Design a binder for this molecule. Sequence first.
Ligand code: GPR
Ligand code: GPR
Lengths: 217, 217
Amino acid sequence: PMILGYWNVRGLTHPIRLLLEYTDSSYEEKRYAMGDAPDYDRSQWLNEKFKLGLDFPNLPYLIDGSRKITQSNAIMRYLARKHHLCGETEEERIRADIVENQVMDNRMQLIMLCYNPDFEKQKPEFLKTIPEKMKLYSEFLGKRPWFAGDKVTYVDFLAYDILDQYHIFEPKCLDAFPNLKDFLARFEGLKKISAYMKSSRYLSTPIFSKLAQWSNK
Amino acid sequence: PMILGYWNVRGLTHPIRLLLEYTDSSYEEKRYAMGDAPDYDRSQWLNEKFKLGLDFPNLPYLIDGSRKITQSNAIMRYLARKHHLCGETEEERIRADIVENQVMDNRMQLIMLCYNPDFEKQKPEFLKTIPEKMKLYSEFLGKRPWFAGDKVTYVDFLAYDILDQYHIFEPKCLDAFPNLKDFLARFEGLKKISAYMKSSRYLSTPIFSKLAQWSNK
Ligand SMILES: N[C@@H](CCC(=O)N[C@@H](CS[C@@H]1c2ccccc2-c2ccccc2[C@H]1O)C(=O)NCC(=O)O)C(=O)O
Ligand SMILES: N[C@@H](CCC(=O)N[C@@H](CS[C@@H]1c2ccccc2-c2ccccc2[C@H]1O)C(=O)NCC(=O)O)C(=O)O
């Protein structure tokens, strides 16, 4: 089978785990565990980081036959090309490219805040920027069923994950944007997705490592 | 013409400027200035941020008629598809995808240090990590003339840029890596590039905004 390697946290790997399920991929995962404070040992990974034949050793990684990939985005794209989940027109391609990169931006923002020792000080302020962020996604999506247009593409798995994370962070953030709540429901309603969510493999939380100030357990 | 907007710094926009030049594109630039400390005024940009019809307003931006794009990597991809500078086979696509994202990781590491108020004390630690980073690029490229294979692709524009930035930061960092010095020369050796470098338009440094601790003026 294919092998997915990552920490035993949702982190930035949710989209790949969902896409493996949606495509009915034959895969097994290696979920590395980090140690407890003060040490937070990374040994389980570190011992084999440079023994896997990866070009640029990192987590997550994907092993698919003789192909070895790192970089979450490159893993998504690889799987999208494999299963025909890319945009079919220039218009869809552009939408997907922008979405993929914007998600990473909004992700880094949450991460950077969640790892700040001053998290509690900062929250209030970060919370005030949510509406403006969500608004942008809502207006982009509009009346379309999916982010790139008429069909589900790999970017919907990226956007699902980030909107879901923001929603966990702030329960009421999507209340003013019905199309986004609708989108979450539509994504969760995809048959393989609905099944996966009830399974033992589903890892919703924690999102972050032991080290973060939020969703660390 | 196409309009490229960004700060009046190199930042993360070098690859686009190089690419517009390499493909002989007709384009004008809007180089926004930032005020000096302590306020670091951003009004030139902010005065029009929400007035350009961008889906997710940001810098850089590229306006190509009706087409309005943000996210640096989506701009590279759009220009790459227009001019057939994408990988042609699966193998080249995967190499491109990984390098694109890896470059961003190595760019973000540099930014994190350069914006750290503990810059001078932090620097030593940073320097120790460079040899490893360069080694991975060196081993990945190997004996290939270009990053994706035997033809220049958009990713060579990204790789050029991050390799050059690190080389400016630590001038002895490529000495141990023959094929990386060769690559820089090959790339700078391209007619259109060589020509641009002599042009009024060329903007090598500052790399960072006025707020940084290095290459800030
Ligand atoms: N840009 C690369 C991310 C590479 C990276 O930072 N990987 C981290 C895990 S993601 C990491 C993370 C860790 C734990 C919990 C959460 C996260 C996470 C979540 C969201 C966004 C980013 C992260 C990273 O901090 C790592 O541990 N790499 C192996 C190594 O360096 O030796 C990619 O998109 O795949
Ligand atoms: N993910 C986006 C980058 C988004 C971004 O942070 N844009 C910055 C400039 S790059 C920014 C930067 C600025 C000056 C100098 C250097 C940099 C830089 C260099 C490398 C990597 C990242 C940066 C950013 O901090 C900006 O000012 N956005 C407009 C806004 O917020 O209203 C992309 O790839 O285009």
